[PDB]
Amino acid sequence: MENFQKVEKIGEGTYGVVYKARNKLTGEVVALKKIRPSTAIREISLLKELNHPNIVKLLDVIHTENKLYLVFEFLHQDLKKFMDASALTGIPLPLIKSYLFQLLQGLAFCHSHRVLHRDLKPQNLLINTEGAIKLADFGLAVVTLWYRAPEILLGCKYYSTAVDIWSLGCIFAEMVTRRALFPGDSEIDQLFRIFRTLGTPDEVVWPGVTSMPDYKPSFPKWARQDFSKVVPPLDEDGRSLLSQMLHYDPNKRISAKAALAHPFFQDVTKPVPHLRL
């Protein structure tokens, strides 16, 4: 832009690059995403009116000279950085619980407004010094596949809100164990890592799975591993909730609204994180 002074590049998605920038006139500090369709533009408008404390605010949309700029409120750190910074000691359970609860509130909100995120990952979950966490970089209707729902990997053409619950479940597990749950480095490796842990799905647990676009009868048949080995440091309420967020059948997978009512959140609080900026 010309009305902006780039302070530094802070990220890059599969459609654009994001910079920390300052409004040369107002002096406000923002996150500016630069991207190099009636559906999109209107899909974006909807995003602008999507206001919730757990959703990064989209301030302005500027279309000029073969470039599309999205101006967002700036947050100081993403969850990936915070997790790395917390790798030696781990994020305290109360904070993990607070973050999960808040993200579920944000998803409950977008989902009730028929908005799907589609690409949740630690890098697009942003945190501030007051203990909040917000959903950022919504996806429109080397890329990381670690948080991709199985139905996407199996070729489903129509995503449902369940894909976001799956991604969030993977992130929840990662915050707890301090290791990515399914770190695949290809679509098939991602799929098979999921199968090796949760068991190769079949018609019993996932009606219709064998008729999905990319399903092959030749997939290996792995037995489901004991769930207590998956996220050991997690108590039973947490494990129960996670298992519901990771159901194979999108229709059995717990909703964000239902997840918010899970016993795991009975004692939820809002701790302040120790952030090094």
Ligand SMILES: COc1cccc(C(=O)c2sc(Nc3ccc(S(N)(=O)=O)cc3)nc2N)c1
């Ligand atoms: C492809 O476009 C994207 C991708 C992901 C997020 C956003 C986005 O809206 C952002 S990023 C941000 N600040 C920030 C991010 C990471 C870090 S770090 N690495 O912890 O030092 C520090 C500050 N604020 C907003 N609002 C845009």
